[PDB]
């Protein structure tokens, strides 16, 4: 099991999505070996504040919407 878990933290909590009205969309900042600094807009699920840290198992993403 050789994964590329790049650790990234929450920059800004955008809004809520998925009419399941439970998913959260967040802007991230990275801190890991590979790149770092790169900002992504990822989709979380669950309790999340500003500044937490989340292990992304795929930096090539960033789906998005705001309407």
């Amino acid at each position: 099991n050789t994964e590329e878990t790049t650790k990234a933290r929450i920059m800004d909590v955008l809004g809520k999505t998925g009419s399941r009205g439970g998913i959260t969309q967040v802007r991230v900042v990275l801190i890991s070996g590979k790149e770092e600094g790169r900002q992504l807009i990822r989709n979380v699920k669950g309790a999340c504040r500003v500044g937490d840290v989340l292990e992304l198992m795929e930096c090539e993403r960033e789906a998005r919407r705001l309407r």
């Binding site: 900002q39 992504l40 807009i41 960033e62 998005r64």
Partner: protein, 98 residues
């Protein structure tokens, strides 16, 4: 009774206007009537351009990626349903370019 003055279209002099196929259903619609909105589309999403700029190659006249040119033509029938133009209220029906 009558709902509109232009009934949705702009044919004001002539008796007949060319028909055109719908960007979405393919349906035939008279030019003048059908909705239009020729837009200046962009090749890549926001944060996604920067990624292609650094790994870019050729010269850099600061002219970036060519922007996509989409000439849009919708027929009423689907134009509506497609969030384009929402059923507007009574007096707002005469408002042009809000």
């Amino acid at each position: 009774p009558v709902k509109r003055r232009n009934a949705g279209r702009s044919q004001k002099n002539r008796g007949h206007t060319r028909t055109v196929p719908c960007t979405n259903c393919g349906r035939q619609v008279a030019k003048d009537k059908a909705v239009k909105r020729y837009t200046v589309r962009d090749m890549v999403d926001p944060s996604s351009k920067r990624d292609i700029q650094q790994k870019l190659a050729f010269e850099n006249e600061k002219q970036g990626i060519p922007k996509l040119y989409v000439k849009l033509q919708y027929c009423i029938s689907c134009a509506i349903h497609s969030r384009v133009v929402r059923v507007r209220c009574a007096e707002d029906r005469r408002i042009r370019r809000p």
